[PDB]
Symmetry: D2
Subunit: 130 residues, 4 copies
């Protein structure tokens, strides 16, 4: 029988965003670019801040929302880490890239996050899946 | 304590692939394209076959392997579904796109899969994370 | 005043494709996946064939078609080259990746192609722009 | 019988005078150097559309082989208020460009492939772009 993967808490993120800029609107769908302006990252094995990035989203009247984002985390001790997100909002899949010797274990991680309280859409908790 | 998401079995995939074509070999890294030639998909709420697609991979001597693939599933009842995979191999994150009325719930799904036995790398089991 | 780049003929492609599989049709757009099953490449630097690849296309309600493809050329001498196409159909922009010593000048090339006859769309001529 | 390949036409489309954040290198290894860089603003000019760049991000990889590949997205807001997504892909210093807008005035750009490069390579933030068709 299929055995599920384990889940281990990885980090929380409290992000700030500029207003979306809609560039392609039809009556049932809007596509936008949104600047990721900052935020704090906090987990057991790393922490830091978001220096910047961009999200591209497509939001349907049917309730679907697809988003793709790249942003960079700089850790407390100075490592730079690219975060690549792809999301069926509010569920977010995450990959990471860094050459930092202390953080390059993230290169092999698939993570997943969602806001624990949808009232507060920009506070997310993420989990390592494996 | 953060609450983890739930995991629900979504589908298995037994995929066939052509040999990789390595186009860029550099210090301790190879980048390749691989054709996805076919495969069977079996889950509680959908099933079908893989019509085709492509995987792009970057494999490092350091053990990291990043891959990104697109392939199309045609269900038994005739729906066409795009699968978008992104992976820190052997861990695979998945998104779906279809306008089929019976299967468009998948548009809101983030799934995750891995081979249950790495002996048989092309048989994977995937889970809906939410 | 602005001075334009120069154009030199790079190669032609006579491509074969599988069926177009439409996976997402709605009022805003029609989205399909299509396999590249083969093809003949001919140019001053090399002849070769298309090993395989995949194209994703979106036809908007507005009429415009945007396509994004990846495919692999293998030259007659066995070198592999990744071709990354992005198109405002029928105008195709092209980027390349190969570590082959004979052909690695392609890494630095931006190319552009289009079918000389729009009722014979699988034959295209491509130009190096710089 | 065979016809000789004939080239497309080039028409000047726009210039961009861009401002950028710091280049944040996240992955340095023997094979390549990978960075993320914010686009903080910029002036868009030319005969077809003018405006400013609202924001965007560029990802670049410099390989050991000497190639520099970059991929960027940024948003132009024109002087009259239309939003246009610009998708760039580059074998630096040569830049290919695609556009997305639903603006009625500017949606001709949806059918455009453009190409640009800095006319002065020691001023990398000023580029001139051409419509190819």
């Amino acid at each position: 029988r299929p055995t599920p993967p384990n889940l281990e808490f990885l980090f929380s993120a409290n992000l700030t965003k500029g207003p979306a800029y809609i560039y392609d609107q039809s009556d049932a769908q809007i596509k936008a670019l949104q600047t990721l302006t900052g935020g704090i990252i906090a987990g057991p094995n790393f922490d830091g801040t978001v220096i910047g990035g961009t999200a591209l989203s497509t939001r349907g009247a049917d309730g679907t929302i697809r988003a793709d984002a790249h942003y960079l985390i700089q850790t407390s001790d100075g490592a730079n880490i690219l975060v690549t997100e792809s999301a069926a909002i509010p569920y977010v899949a995450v990959l990471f890239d860094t050459s930092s010797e202390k953080y390059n274990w993230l290169n092999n991680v698939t993570a997943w996050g969602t806001p624990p309280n949808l009232n507060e859409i920009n506070f997310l908790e993420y989990w390592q899946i494996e």
